[PDB]
Subunit: 318 residues, 4 copies
């Protein structure tokens, strides 16, 4: 029996006897994602090249912002693309706070690398007039989170309390189809993913863990290496195949590079609902209390056996 | 003044007062590429999931296999998917021999990684009846070669004598728009790309070259690392951004993993026409005389300064 | 401030404090309509004609049937294609009865004429086992009705107690965009639409009315004539421009050609919700109490002044 | 064996050892038709209604004119272009000139496109017969001189119908891959149909031959079945139905439209040419449409076309009343 993201979230919502706002929100997100995919896939590029006579970052941000605002389900919107939190105008305010990265990985989108949209959804916890402060919530408080991946196909991965579900965008009918239900990550994987160009500034624990993957001391096959350079692609692979992903801290970068509110946390939430783990090396990513909406956080995520092994090496150096 | 693949190839052919076969071939290949892109982007997957009540490898092969047969421009077809060369039926025989990987990278299609269609086109040399022998020419003898990348967008990259030109698929109108003319690769890059999971197996030249990239003995910034794990993706980025790509040999894969006929030679050709290089370490990829349509080869290709640097390391250890 | 059919419908549902089934029903129908639109525009047709080597009646009807069964919102499904009402199996049953024409007008689709999907939705309030007799209801009992027209573009027209709203299918993102709110028909129009090839068989009141259009007796401008031959096209033009559409009785169809349950009633309901009218000559279309799910009715609909003019002529003869 | 428009027109050019200009022209047009089709089907309409806030917006009939004009210019194959939209024939800039003269209606029927009526693009292609600088006069040729002609139909599906001396061929647009698939080869029209098409609102102003012929279609004198009526109001749709089911389509001369309404150069001629190559007929009542020597690029003409027996039957009535 065929299932869409809309049918799926409606049935979850009416079982919880909710007000409808979260379903309104995810439909808006879904619509924005579909438009982003059309633009990423370069539909109508011919017109820009003069076919009739006479920004992807920004257009993606513009779609997520406007679609989310017009949902009447949000009050505060934090985007990688905006210096300050966007306060929804009063007559459109709903009860959710969304943090998102509209087109993650676009830094190298000139080579047609996979990119994605990342989102995490919170309840406003206070009745104060809405402010930046409403996004300064730990990942533990997440209500929903996930990502759209613009890869060889476009897929939305959606994480809630009910688990992780994968919807494939059928572009012929603009409908997100349920194709993988209540997904769970391998307890131990065989791929490791991190940018080894930074090896000279590696934290010595990172160096030892990576060297244990390439030169294991126990009969075992060395892990394979993958590193797309686009987080949504690398994390999604980690979830499908298992294994470990790392953007760790070092001495030039005490807090890693990736941003906690709209990269690290949603991915950490997907991982943990998938039975995986996500650490900074000092604590669970979902346990960090943010003080700045654009703050960075180290992230080591993926299969639990692998993340656990990394923390074993990490502690050995602390 | 807008240009398309069909227009570009017709004009080069009209200028060469040709027979029109290569243009029938490249236009048929374009049709097959667009059907692949639609299918890879999940065209109508909702029918497969029961929307009306009621293999990506195989279909892509069938689309290229049939469209080329149907061009009347080919007589021998070699595909990764087929054990032996396809001999076109006499009624449809043309003068060209085509070696292709129909959906390269698809072993990891489950995580929606970038995939691609790699192709290389030869003129039949022998006057014998057509056979597998006709595909055993050195890459030097290539008339045309290139790839279609199914990434964030679908792009066709075609290399001929005139150079390497890049065409974006506008899926809104199904047309390959010329977006980069007469492309040339950077003289020296800032990215290296190889599966370092086989580090335990690297010969000393690769180990030293890779050490040079993470710990440059000269002041400089270390290279960044990218390994998508799909050759079309990794090579295109190399082309677009510069740098070096490597699949050296290892314990499994003593002759290297990638395929000479329909993976290495097309990419080496694209690269050489772009000002780049492509070596096996011992010789240029295009000088290897094949003996078996599916034989493997080591490959180091990319920006010329980076490949020359690798070869100086190779010599030091030779 | 953009708005979608999905967003519009659940916002009407939230306000009504309803059970959700109507939204699940209409969202499922929307999916069917998007799949039909794609097939109607012949996407994937090249696969039929050999692109890779190796019925719109039936296919559209399968799409509506399964999408409606899948919604859990219907219990009795009457369609043009099926001799009997389809009873939904117990575990998928909802409270709604849907009568539809899955691909109205398709008899002449070999000529690429406009076609569409007509639907009408009644509630069942028996507590008896659902049965075909639950579809024998006057149009007055319609909960919702409308149509999807596959014209130069695809539009869904949806009518409820809150009025008529018009949604454009954006094929780039597979979304139904609200483009015309709370629409109302022109008080009087300038187009009359019917098959004049039945002139030898018209009742004299039909004959007199047509003559008034061609030789206006108040010395106004003659009406223009338009007959696409496809009910959805002809009715939609009537809704947008005003005027009158007629399929009266003739020798081959002594009580009309078009079907009361899933052709006349939905169109009649849409007309009355846009401030137009729909009569059989003797009574309001919506007032007919049917005794057979496939029974036919004469229909005259359009702008109220035009229908009243026909009725003044009809009454002069009865 | 699968055949696209590009492949079918290419192999025709190889057979005749041509310069490639006509193929570059039709490929140009095919690109324009595909862009028009995507816009007609409201491709990115949601941006117009603000899914991304405030950031073409032309009116489709204007977009289509730009699309056809630009593509044809860029084909390097045309010297004089005539459009319904521009009062004067466009002279292609010299750098871009080729041998063909093209007359087209970029989005015919678009007046009612707000009701999502079927619409279409019409074209006819001539060679330049003059030796002078290209001028408007170069498009004042009789339909007889047409090299190729046809139309795109933006109906429930998009289809390009292409007529040349080799006959009439129908190519269905596959929007999934942007390819025109040859689906009906060497089409021919039924010798006699069962549908008549014309705007009967103008009955009061009809010529008496039209009145009689139409009354014959409704009240036949020989116990034949009366014809059915269809009239989309959109020439491309009506003429295509005529090509596929047979029958007759009429926009005839009026008391108040002494020269009909449809434009000779880029509406009647291409439809007349498509009919003639498909085994049918196309008359003004007083001559074959294609024989009319035009003196104005925007002059109009009566046009009766369709099944040969039906047009003939009509002319008998026309000769009786003359
Ligand atoms: C765990 O996953 C979640 C996803 C979404 C949401 S929610 O906040 O967005 N709620 C909805 O979506 C939603 C609720 C609802 C109801 C419904 C039924 C009984 C009680 C109430 N509620 C009161 C009396 O207060 C409502 C009926 C029909 C539809 N329907 O089919 O549209 C509904 N949809 C929450 C959780
Ligand atoms: C470097 O790039 C290439 C790509 C393709 C090819 S080729 O082998 O496929 N030939 C073609 O493409 C091609 C040729 C050609 C001609 C043409 C003109 C004068 C002489 C001849 N020939 C004889 C007298 O024998 C032909 C006219 C119109 C078109 N046209 O616009 O369709 C043409 N297309 C070669 C090289
Ligand atoms: C006139 O137009 C219509 C269109 C649709 C419908 S309905 O019957 O299918 N209802 C729905 O769709 C729908 C209801 C609903 C609720 C909701 C809220 C308070 C009470 C209840 N109900 C109980 C306690 O019993 C439900 C909350 C959120 C969403 N939401 O935004 O998903 C909802 N959607 C009716 C009429
Ligand atoms: C009946 O319908 C028509 C449709 C199209 C045309 S044409 O004028 O546009 N010619 C073409 O299209 C076209 C020609 C051509 C040739 C070719 C071959 C031998 C000689 C010459 N010519 C010289 C020596 O002068 C050319 C080779 C390859 C391709 N090819 O497959 O690319 C070609 N395409 C005319 C009529
Ligand atoms: O180049 P690096 O330092 O390896 O970083 C790659 C990381 O940066 C990101 O591209 C974030 O950068 P963007 O601003 O382009 O979104 C992540 O997707 C990815 O994980
Ligand atoms: O898994 P590895 O050892 O890194 O090898 C990856 C290589 O294998 C390939 O995927 C071969 O392609 P396939 O997926 O078609 O087998 C190349 O694209 C890629 O460069
Ligand atoms: O050809 P006629 O007798 O004028 O009737 C046309 C009517 O028939 C219909 O096409 C219904 O028939 P089909 O659905 O079988 O094609 C209506 O859409 C249209 O109004
Ligand atoms: O409404 P009328 O007078 O019957 O004329 C309709 C005719 O006019 C046209 O619409 C002319 O097209 P335009 O919409 O571009 O004016 C033809 O397509 C059609 O045959």
């Amino acid at each position: 029996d065929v299932n869409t993201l809309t049918r799926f979230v409606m049935e979850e919502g009416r079982k919880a006897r909710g007000t409808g706002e979260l379903t309104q929100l995810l439909n808006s997100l879904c619509t924005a994602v579909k438009a982003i995919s059309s633009a990423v896939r370069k539909a109508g590029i011919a017109h820009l090249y003069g076919i009739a006579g006479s920004k992807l970052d920004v257009l993606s941000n513009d779609l997520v912002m406007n679609m989310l605002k017009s949902s009447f389900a949000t009050c505060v919107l934090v985007s990688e693309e905006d210096k300050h939190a966007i306060i929804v105008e009063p007559e459109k305010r709903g009860k959710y706070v969304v943090c998102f990265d509209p087109l993650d990985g676009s830094s190298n989108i000139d080579c047609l690398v996979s990119v994605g949209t990342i989102f995490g959804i919170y309840r406003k916890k206070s009745t104060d007039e809405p402010s930046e402060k409403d996004a300064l919530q730990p990942g533990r408080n997440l209500v929903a989170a996930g990502y759209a991946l613009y890869g060889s196909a476009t897929m939305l991965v959606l994480a809630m309390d009910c688990g992780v579900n994968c919807f494939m965008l059928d572009p012929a009918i603009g409908e997100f189809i349920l194709v993988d239900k209540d997904v769970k990550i391998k307890k131990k994987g065989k791929i490791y993913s991190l940018n080894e160009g930074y090896a000279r500034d590696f934290d010595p624990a990172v160096t030892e863990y990576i060297q244990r993957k390439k030169f294991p001391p126990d009969n075992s096959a060395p892990y394979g290496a993958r590193y797309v350079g686009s987080m949504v692609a690398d994390v999604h692979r980690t979830l499908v195949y298992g294994g470990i992903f790392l953007y760790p801290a070092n001495k030039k970068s005490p807090n890693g590079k990736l941003r906690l509110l709209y990269e690290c946390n949603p991915m950490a939430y997907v991982m943990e609902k998938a039975g995986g783990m996500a650490t900074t090396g000092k604590e669970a990513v979902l346990d960090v209390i943010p003080t700045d909406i654009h703050q960075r956080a180290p992230v080591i995520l993926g299969s639990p056996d692998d993340v656990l092994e990394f923390l074993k090496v990490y502690e050995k150096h602390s």
